[PDB]
Structures are given as C-alpha cells and as structure tokens.
Amino acid sequence: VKVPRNFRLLEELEEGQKGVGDGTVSWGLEDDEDMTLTRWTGMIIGPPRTNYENRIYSLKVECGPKYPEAPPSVRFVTKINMNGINNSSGMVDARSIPVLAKWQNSYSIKVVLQELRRLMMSKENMKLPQPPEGQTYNN
Amino acid sequence: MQIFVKTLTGKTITLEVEPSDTIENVKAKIQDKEGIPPDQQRLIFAGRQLEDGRTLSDYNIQKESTLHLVLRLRGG
C-alpha cells in the first residue's frame, strides 16, 4: 500500500470536508464507503457576475498510485463550457490547466479546484455560453 | 456541540446545536444571531449541498466542523 498516498489523501479528506483554502470550494469521498481513496468528488460554486453565476459544478477526481507526485485524473460531471474541458466526456486537459501541466508534488486536489474556479473568472471562459443547467456528461 | 459556520465572506460563527437538530432550525438560529434570512442560506459540506428538512446526523456532521454558508442570491 502506498503509505504517502494513503496518508496524504486522508489529510486532504479533512481539508475537503472543512472546505479549507479559498472557501468557495469543497471536495471529499464520493462513495464514502470506498476507503481506497481513489474516488473523490469535487464541487465548485460558480462565481457570481459570470456565466457560471450560481452554478454548482460537480467534478470527479481519481488520485493514482503516483499521487501526489503525479497529476490525478480530473473530469467534470455537469455540462460546462470552459477551455480545456471536453464537451462529450467533460474530461479536463492537463496541458490546458497551468497546475496540471506544471504539476508539483506540493499541490493537492484543493489547488486544482481553486485553479479551475480561478480560470472560470478569466475573460476567455467567463463569457462562454453555457448549456442548459442540470445536464450531465453521464446519466 | 459547537460547530463553525463559515460564510463565503470569511466570517466564522460558532453554533451550539445537537446532531438531532434540523438544518431548517440551524438556519433559524443563524438568522437570530447573525440576521441572515434562512431563505438565502445554502450549506455546503463534504463537497455536496445540504438540505433543509434533514438533521446534522444525516450528513454525519460532528463537532468543530467548519460548515460553508453559501449565500443563495434570490432576486437580483
């Protein structure tokens, strides 16, 4: 068992539950029963005055065995029109997101969600026409 | 138990409630001490949205938990 991975994920679980960091971000175990810590859920509260205003976006994060040395798998569940996000799967691209492209072991899921929300406030995304709220890439 | 209700504004208030208490009542208590209308109160925990007609035990909320109070802008 990956001692650092398990230990780190257990710590990030706390930060996710308490929503520490920026404040407008939260995450945690999606299944909850799955203590392997390989199924994380992320929630980003859309910033007001933008096209994501009052839009609660949900994401899915999967931390591999190389975590946190290697970048985890992050994808959107709710339909969102943002640069770097696939329109069919909702999968986020690594080279498109600064923190994913230039990932560091000092990063965390917290930083990822915060960065994504930060990029949502960017001019290139804040004015992107969003599809009907409620539509998901699956189910 | 003492819980920490932190609003997106930054302010963190302490609430003395029991797990058997409903969020609908929790909001009312916040409305009494802070003055924030329950209608525009939206609690976020464990990366998910909480309901009104549910108890703190419904989301497994314990003591010293920093809940997130997201203002639900209604009319603007």
UniProtKB/Swiss-Prot annotation, chain A:
Homology family: Belongs to the ubiquitin-conjugating enzyme family.
Transmembrane region(s): none
Highest taxon listed in the record's lineage: Eukaryota
Domain UBC core positions: 4-139
One Gene Ontology term from the biological process aspect of the record: regulation of DNA repair
One term under GO cellular component: cytoplasm
Annotated SUPFAM superfamilies: UBC-like
Taxonomy of the source species: Eukaryota, Metazoa, Chordata, Craniata, Vertebrata
Stated name of the protein: Ubiquitin-conjugating enzyme E2 variant 2
Function per UniProt: Has no ubiquitin ligase activity on its own. The UBE2V2/UBE2N heterodimer catalyzes the synthesis of non-canonical poly-ubiquitin chains that are linked through 'Lys-63'. This type of poly-ubiquitination does not lead to protein degradation by the proteasome. Mediates transcriptional activation of target genes. Plays a role in the control of progress through the cell cycle and differentiation. Plays a role in the error-free DNA repair pathway and contributes to the survival of cells after DNA damage.
Keywords: Acetylation, Ubl conjugation pathway
Pfam families, per the entry: UQ_con
Tissue: Detected in placenta, colon, liver and skin. Detected at very low levels in most tissues.
InterPro entries with a match to the protein in the record: UBQ-conjugat_E2_core, UBQ-conjugating_enzyme/RWD
Statement: the UniProt record of this protein carries the keyword Acetylation: yes
Subunit composition and interactions: Heterodimer with UBE2N. Binds CHFR.
Induction: Up-regulated in cultured fresh blood cells upon treatment with vitamin D3.
Curated annotation (Swiss-Prot), chain B:
Cross-link (Glycyl lysine isopeptide (Gly-Lys) (interchain with K-? in acceptor proteins)): G76
Signal peptide: none
Domain Ubiquitin-like: 1-76
Subcellular localization(s) per the UniProt record: Cytoplasm; Nucleus
Effect upon mutating K63R: Deficiency in ubiquitin-protein conjugate formation. Loss of DNA repair function
Effect listed in the UniProt record for changing K29R: Deficiency in ubiquitin-protein conjugate formation
Function: Exists either covalently attached to another protein, or free (unanchored). When covalently bound, it is conjugated to target proteins via an isopeptide bond either as a monomer (monoubiquitin), a polymer linked via different Lys residues of the ubiquitin (polyubiquitin chains) or a linear polymer linked via the initiator Met of the ubiquitin (linear polyubiquitin chains).
Protein name: Ubiquitin
Organism listed in the record: Saccharomyces cerevisiae (strain ATCC 204508 / S288c)
